[PDB]
Amino acid sequence: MQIFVKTLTGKTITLEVEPSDTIENVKAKIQDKEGIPPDQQRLIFAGKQLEDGRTLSDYNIQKESTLHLVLRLRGG
Numbered sequence: 001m002q003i004f005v006k007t008l009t010g011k012t013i014t015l016e017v018e019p020s021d022t023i024e025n026v027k028a029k030i031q032d033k034e035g036i037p038p039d040q041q042r043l044i045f046a047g048k049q050l051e052d053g054r055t056l057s058d059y060n061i062q063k064e065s066t067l068h069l070v071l072r073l074r075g076g
Contacts, residue, residue, distance in 0.1 A: 004066045005066070008071070013034065020057060023052055023053065027043070041069055042070045043069060043070075044068045045067050045068065
């Protein structure tokens with residue numbers, strides 16, 4: 001299925017994945033595609049933080065849907 005990643009910088013990226021794919025496997029795809037480590041980004045969708053080991057189908061997502069990508073929480 002095709003999906004679009006909307007970044008805060010306004011960059012839209014297209015990724016191909018499977019509904020039975022695990023968030024851990026989906027993070028691997030983003031890591032090898034953008035090259036940004038997974039511990040530097042947090043995937044938010046429908047208002048939930050994708051947990052490692054869960055399947056996309058567990059979120060009832062929809063093909064061609066857009067996922068929100070956040071870097072990290074401001075702090076110090």
